[PDB]
Each structure stands twice: as C-alpha cells, then as structure tokens.
Amino acid sequence: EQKQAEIIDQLVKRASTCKSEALGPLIIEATSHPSLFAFSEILALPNVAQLEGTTDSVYLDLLRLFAHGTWGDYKCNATRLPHLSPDQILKLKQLTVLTLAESNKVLPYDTLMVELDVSNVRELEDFLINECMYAGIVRGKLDQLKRCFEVPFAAGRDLRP
Ligand SMILES: [Mg+2]
Ligand SMILES: [Mg+2]
C-alpha cells in the first residue's frame, strides 16, 4: 500500500504491449481497481493520449476525470461519459476526499456532504471510516462535536514518477 505502485506497473506494461483496442477496457479496469488512486502516469502514456479523436476518446475523457476531477465534475459531464459502476462511483468519491484534503487539513462536515452527495452525518462518517480510512488513503480524526474531519495524512492524487 503501495501495492498501488505494483498495479501501476502491471497496467503500464500491459498498456505498452496490448492492442490500442484494449485500452478502453484497461481504463475501465484501472478506474475500478480497489488499490488504485493515482492515474497521472497512466494518463501520460502516449498509448492513451492517442485515443483522442477515436471512437474510444470518451474513455480518455473518463481517465482524465479520474486523474483530475471530482464527483461534481462527473455529474457535470455525465451525459458525455459512460455510466459508472458502484465501484467507480465509490472511487471518485474517495478521490474527491483526497482533493479536499490537499487544499485543507481540516474539512467541515457540511462541505464534505455537498461534495460527496451524502445526506447525513452518519452516512458521511461511515464513508470516511469504512471506505476512506479502510482503504488506507487517509488517516485522521473525526470530531463529532465540531463537525469536522481533521486529515493530516492523505494519499496524493498527482503521485507520479
Ligand atoms: Mg491522478
Ligand atoms: Mg493536483
């Protein structure tokens, strides 16, 4: 954990040996993979960049989203992207927490709820503990009285060579 560096290795090796037709499926695989949170190195592959202009360009758009965007960016672009699976939705919400933690080491519950489309503090805390801390991508403290998440330790999305 990295575990991530290992999967990036396997994916880069496959992307640079497989037919270009296999790249869309590889992108769906990457964005569904339980241990993968950093997509920059994959996005930067010349193999992937060359999907632009092709029938699979929407999958490059999907990869760009997972590299750089938040759950909100997906909602904005949903009519021009494939529909996401539960695993992809979960991952984009986890990545959104990582983006927020990059900007601020104290995250108000109200901000988190808007960014993640979580309706209540229970659902929010459950997500932070049972999906984010569980995955090893953040370590911090929940302050129920102050309604905030103090997150000194968060995985970086722009983690790259
Ligand atoms: Mg990334
Ligand atoms: Mg960044």
Curated annotation (Swiss-Prot):
GO cellular component, one term: cytoplasm
Gene name, Swiss-Prot/TrEMBL: CSN7
Native organism: Arabidopsis thaliana
Comment field on protein domains: The PCI domain is not sufficient to efficiently mediate CSN complex assembly and for biological activity.
Reported function: Component of the COP9 signalosome complex (CSN), a complex involved in various cellular and developmental processes such as photomorphogenesis and auxin and jasmonate responses. The CSN complex is an essential regulator of the ubiquitin (Ubl) conjugation pathway by mediating the deneddylation of the cullin subunits of SCF-type E3 ligase complexes, leading to decrease the Ubl ligase activity of SCF. It is involved in repression of photomorphogenesis in darkness by regulating the activity of COP1-containing Ubl ligase complexes.
A GO BP annotation: COP9 signalosome assembly
Main location: cytoplasm
Protein name per its UniProtKB record: COP9 signalosome complex subunit 7
Keyword check for Nucleus: yes
Family of this protein: Belongs to the CSN7/EIF3M family. CSN7 subfamily.
Portion of the full-length sequence here: 4 to 164 of 260
Effect ascribed to mutating residue 9 to A: No effect on the interaction with CSN8
Lineage of the organism: Eukaryota, Viridiplantae, Streptophyta, Embryophyta, Tracheophyta
Domain spans labelled PCI: 1-156
